[PDB]
Design a protein around this ligand. Structure first.
Ligand code: AGS
Ligand code: AGS
Ligand code: AGS
Ligand code: ADP
Ligand code: ADP
Lengths: 582, 568, 568
């Protein structure tokens, strides 16, 4: 009949057992039954945020009907998953949709109060038969709803509920709101323990139950895209397919929690991966790798090494971010170099990061540049720069440079940030900063540091510059810092080592060009004499390397003088540096 | 069948072996096997720019099925492909999209899930008038659908990441543009099929030349599509050259011909001094300095996070400073149209910076945008021109330091504006009379050092630290500017010969034209407008009276203080 | 045969001369053979225009096939024009027309590549009404189709390229517009055809005049089809002149009569100032600038690929910029109420672009057009008015740069909108108070320079370089007020003579008006409402009183200050 054409019996499928076991949801199914045994407006609607198991509530109710675990008034009923695409499709003629829907309604009256109706996507039922001068499904179902003589069950997302049903109050009051919350962690672990049998029967592999509880735990903590139980189910399924292809292509036979971590790190790259000996010996050689690019300035290397080790070691403060820092020193001591060193350690690249230089924000209102603009105003549909740049890749490094340049009340934003890792952009959603490192640099007591780094300890220098910082900032803000570090002007040996590093990357780029070039150490001594001052550090070394290398060497390369394969000693002139061809 | 209406079997031709021997992109096929062997959510989607061979990915998967190179759950499948461009274009009224859609769904339910479907342009599925998310999203969750999606990330997040319920089923597979060497590997995998088609041979140096030049010069279509197109059309051209009335191997010469029509790079960089004197007379040392700086930028020794060249320009304005920038843009990248003239005379405030970089959101000039950075974003290979940089607000120099340090600049709207492909020209006139009054017999270098010390007392030292070289722009004499006036007369005669008039000139008339608007204080454009307004206005007055005839010799003979036109 | 039902062979028509003589186009048919000589994407498609001989390119292909002017692999191939409606005309069943289509496709598979087909309007096969385009798409993606398409770039870009398998069987084979000389050669190919039809003769100076004046004065109708139109319409005109109640040679004067029906102002142009000061008194520098423009453009000193006059009328209110526009309409265009009046000052909205331009498919302004380019599509020869430029959007300025670049417009649907013959002058005021103070005691040059600096602060710098000339309107002197007051008295005399009343004035009353309604600081309309009040209000008091008998002279006598009309 017409019920055969447009409806699908879920209860016959659960009678075949071809539906999923549904475990839990007891108050939700009980209130759904309480609404379904009424006199007027029998119709519960499963308002719940997208992917918390709303279809599975009705499927589990169908299974409880088949098992006979319902009250006596529901024993022997039929749940029919109504189809909207079956009804819209065949009707470009006038009245043909209304013909079908009225025939369905007369069949449902004919079934004598035995058919439970399930309508997935109730928001699809709203704009259903919207042809020019045509009733939708609302204008035809709406009689039989509030006489109680239809046993509809809605299932809709809450954002679809606002736009598509709360806009139409008449059909909005015909139903009964059933909030279906995202489950907490422990109950989701229980549900996943229920569903282990299905995936074991599907992929013929086994699952570690610690991997299950780790998938639920890490999914609730780190992934902010989807919602429970959906994200954890997808973790388990994708791990199962990965193990199946590891076996079948070319080891193991189960699904460990390390496989869960590999799935999560493949999905984003938050380094939940366990400390393998390459990674763990890398992490124990933290300061050694930081002094592969940054000579000197030991104490901040120590502090950030400590913070990243406490992050990776499973001792993360789960609400504050990784490290809430503050760098302080005179101009040109490689503060940005240390930040690029962290980026290169973490991501194998300097500019795989976000640097936002706060000298651009010397006015107040650029707060709205990084957090966005409210509803109504100009740049609403774009988001703040900082929030979006986190919202793509949350495991990153957020760098603020020249923090003395901006207005003091930009730093209520970072009060939020360093309190909880939370930030709310102009559209009004939270952005998790629990995988970020915040570094702020200034040159506050640079006169005081250049004056008194000699003949003083590190500690009371930090004390005195902290007093200067309290003269600068707010007591709220500097409480949020994990650790304030102090930089110092470098000796000439540090600048000679930096010149060695610049010669290393120069010879790297000239082997890329294809030239075997060496240097006299006297030329290194002359370059150390040239770009040196205690007041400015190595940016004079930058310009000295720039001029006295990049001008004559590249001038003689383009002069046809430098032949590849020749030994090229960068020896000295009387006042300059000369290359040879030997 | 309704399968004989909108579906395409690729296991058909792959069982026949009559498709592309798809080589490469193994990992994307592997992740497609990862998604398709799940229990649920078995509809992978492919993400990339159009023309990256996603159809070839599906066909190579089909060939691995035919070859038995797949695990034992992918076998017996039938590769199908549904149109998203006829289910709507045929759809007149209510339910012709949905009618065909449910007919496809039931006829695949007859197929009992042994069928893999392809769908391109997943963005088209969302908006068609409701349509298909509400009818495939059950099959997306039922698992009986075995779709293969294909679209681009921008349409994906514009349309499809709106509804997260549609987002949670499809699994993103990034298919980027392949490299030039991956293109080489694919074409070496496909040179056999070409040479068996046209019965010719193919030069593999011409293959790598075609790949490199297609990567460099043309960015309309991309790899591997443009390489296939250029190889096939060049092979067609060689085939016509054979069958016209002689080589079978397609050469890179025909590649360059179809390239430019349908190589002067390296030595043009080497001869850049001659290039700068192709249109500009005088300023020989400045020409040499600019050409050496260009070659050093192309030498590939400097910072890969710093631009082509940092420059500050001084001297008397209007003498060819802008003309140097025009010819520099011409023989640098294209022509006289990749440049932005910017007066720093205006910008003297904080909202000056908010103008030029970009407004914060919620404010006045936001999607009107920054005056500089939007024009950079439109023309990523240009030359940036600045005028009267001493009239700037001091915080603009912080932005300039960000330019010369990082080669990039976050605008007000919040994105990356790269600067490593342009030339920063900043013009000033602070040491004007230091160069003008001391033009006589003083060298280029010590005048440069003297005005360098002067501007060092003027500007910030850290600002001019970043500047590579400040050329002098010495005031050109009467002979150079007279020659420029002669070149303007030449292009004037060119346009009037386009109109079609044999026009001569007296040399005394040439001297009076050179002495109309010569001025060392203002520039060459006073001479230009002087000669222009003297000649042009009585000319057409004589013309449209009915006096001048095309073909008559028009000598610009002198009057006592004017120039008269004769018809002989 | 079933192929003999409703197919039109073209190889026999080229063999038996039943086609038309197709002349030239070697490179296009060469690349056609190139697309024919490929392994993939083997079918070409004539991306073309309304009236550029796409079917004639098909005819020339068939002519070169029969003449042996093709390669050996394509000689003797069957070229049949499949007729669309002829299959439709003998069919009335859903399954008989489709039966015919299936049978012809099976016969095309049966002929085994010998048939090389052609079907124009491939988009029409996509939407004819299983539609026929998606029915032939298996013949696309089964390696059997040798057909050729023909359409506009819009339908190829939207209905074909956006489809997938319909993309990867074709190319962007673009039909070019031919030259004027090629058009004359084709006219020589079919001069004798029209002459033997209409029993007339055609002069070859009339041929070259028809082609050249169609190339210049016509842009919507196109080469070569506009020449077809003009020649055949002139032939019918000469046939009328014979059969009226004599000539047989079609002259170029007949082409001029055709073009005008669908004259001594060149030396009146030397009396420009006379007519301008007849309508717009004073403002001598603007008169000189407009005179220089009209001289140097109709004589053609600059590029004639531009609109003729591109001015920014600047100055305070009440200077008659609108009056000078209407005076130019009177002089050059002889039609005062033929001008395209659209103000800039509605268009700061982002969504104004629909109405102010013309729309791509995706707007509802696509369902009527853009009201500017609609007006140029109606009126391709007039003055377009853009008042108050200071209230615009910057993309509208980019549209202005498109106008100042092309001399035409590739509009919102990519079709013909032409701009060379039209004269677009925008008006503004932005140098208002500078002129209102310092037009006195200053020159015209430095004022122009300073207001140019002001507009440079307003606009883009090279945008206002594209102005024909920055022109200056200014306050006016004493006698100009009296002359224009005499003009307004004349139109008052005309209005009341059409009422039936005849008016004499005292010159004392003229001096009373010139001393009452006077200040140059604002504009003209203080004088206009002074006239209005101090004349009409006692006059409307007297006439609606029923007192004034017609015939008696209405003498504008004076009081000490006021104006009295008497009846003696
Ligand atoms: N209590 C539960 N017991 C067993 N499986 C569950 C339970 N809750 C959710 N699931 C599973 O969670 C997955 C997703 O739930 P679904 O109901 O299918 O998604 P959904 O509720 O339709 O969300 P939307 O609205 O479609 S985005 C399914 O595989 C369900 O089997
Ligand atoms: N690994 C490969 N081996 C062989 N051919 C390839 C390979 N990768 C790409 N191709 C070819 O490259 C061309 C690209 O065409 P498409 O498959 O249509 O590109 P696409 O990624 O599908 O994007 P669009 O939107 O469909 S054009 C096809 O002719 C493929 O056969
Ligand atoms: N210079 C003038 N010569 C003659 N009539 C003028 C002049 N200036 C204004 N008018 C009169 O003013 C009206 C023309 O409209 P207006 O907008 O005033 O033109 P306009 O001179 O351009 O002033 P603006 O700048 O457009 S506000 C008509 O009544 C004209 O007769
Ligand atoms: N310890 C160091 N290691 C490597 N480079 C350094 C070091 N100290 C200074 N430099 C050089 O000096 C510059 C200092 O950079 P940055 O940290 O931005 O200076 P500031 O201290 O003003 O922030 C760098 O560009 C780098 O080239
Ligand atoms: N070389 C030529 N020889 C003869 N006629 C030509 C030639 N080129 C173009 N034509 C004419 O141009 C006309 C336009 O042809 P067609 O492409 O069918 O129109 P449209 O471009 O409007 O579709 C044809 O009638 C044809 O006679």
């Amino acid at each position: 009949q017409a019920l055969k054409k447009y409806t699908i019996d879920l209860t016959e499928r659960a009678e075949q057992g071809k539906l999923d076991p549904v475990i839990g949801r007891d108050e939700e199914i009980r209130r759904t039954i309480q609404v379904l045994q009424r006199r007027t407006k029998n119709n519960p609607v499963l308002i719940g945020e997208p992917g918390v198991g709303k279809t599975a509530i009705v499927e589990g109710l169908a299974q409880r009907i088949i098992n006979g675990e319902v009250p006596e008034g529901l024993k022997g009923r039929r749940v029919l998953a109504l189809d909207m695409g079956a009804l819209v499709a065949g009707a470009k003629y006038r009245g043909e949709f209304e013909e079908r829907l009225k025939g369905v309604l007369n069949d449902l009256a004919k079934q004598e109060g035995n058919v439970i109706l399930f309508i997935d996507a109730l928001h699809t039922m709203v704009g259903a038969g919207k042809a020019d001068g045509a009733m939708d499904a609302g204008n035809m179902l709406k009689p039989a709803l509030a006489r109680g003589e239809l046993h509809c069950v809605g299932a809709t997302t809450l954002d679809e509920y606002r736009q598509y049903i709360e806009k139409d109050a008449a059909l909005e009051r015909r139903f009964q709101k059933v909030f279906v919350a995202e489950p907490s962690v422990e109950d989701t672990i229980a549900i996943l323990r229920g569903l282990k049998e299905r995936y074991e029967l599907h992929h013929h592999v086994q699952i570690t139950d610690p991997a299950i509880v780790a998938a639920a735990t890490l999914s609730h903590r780190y992934i902010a895209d989807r919602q429970l139980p959906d994200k954890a189910i997808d973790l388990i399924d994708e791990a199962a397919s990965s193990i199946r292809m590891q076996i079948d292509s070319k080891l193991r036979n189960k699904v460990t929690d390390a496989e869960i971590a590999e799935v999560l790190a493949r999905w984003t790259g938050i380094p939940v991966s366990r400390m393998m000996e390459s990674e763990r010996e890398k992490l124990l050689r933290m300061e050694q790798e930081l002094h592969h690019r940054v000579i000197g300035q030991n104490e901040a290397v120590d502090a950030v090494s400590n913070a990243i080790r406490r992050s990776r070691a499973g001792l993360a403060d789960p609400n504050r971010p990784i490290g809430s820092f503050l760098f302080l020193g005179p101009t040109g001591v490689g503060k940005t170099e240390l930040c690029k060193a962290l980026a290169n350690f973490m991501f194998d690249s300097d500019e795989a990061m976000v640097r936002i230089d706060m000298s651009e924000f010397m006015e107040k209102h650029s707060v709205s540049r990084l957090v966005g603009a409210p509803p109504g105003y100009v740049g609403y549909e774009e988001g703040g720069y900082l929030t979006e740049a986190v919202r793509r890749r949350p495991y990153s490094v957020i760098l603020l440079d020249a923090v003395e340049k901006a207005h003091p009340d930009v730093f209520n934003i970072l009060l939020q940030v360093l309190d909880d890792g939370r930030l709310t952009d102009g559209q009004g959603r939270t952005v998790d900063f629990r995988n970020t490192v915040v570094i702020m640099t200034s040159n506050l007591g640079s006169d005081l540091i250049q004056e008194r780094f000699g003949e003083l300890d590190y500690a009371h220098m930090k004390e005195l510059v902290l007093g200067v910082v309290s003269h600068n900032f707010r007591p709220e803000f500097i409480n949020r810092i994990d650790e304030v570090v102090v930089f110092h002007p470098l000796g000439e040996q540090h600048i000679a080592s930096i010149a060695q590093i610049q010669l290393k990357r120069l010879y790297k780029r000239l082997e890329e060009r294809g030239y075997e070039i060496h240097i006299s150490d006297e030329a290194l001594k002359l370059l150390s004499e040239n770009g040196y001052d205690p007041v400015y550090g190595a940016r004079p070394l930058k310009r000295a390397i720039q001029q006295q290398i990049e001008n004559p060497l590249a001038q003689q390369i383009l002069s046809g003088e430098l032949v590849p394969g020749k030994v090229i000693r960068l020896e000295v002139n009387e006042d300059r540096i000369v290359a040879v061809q030997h």
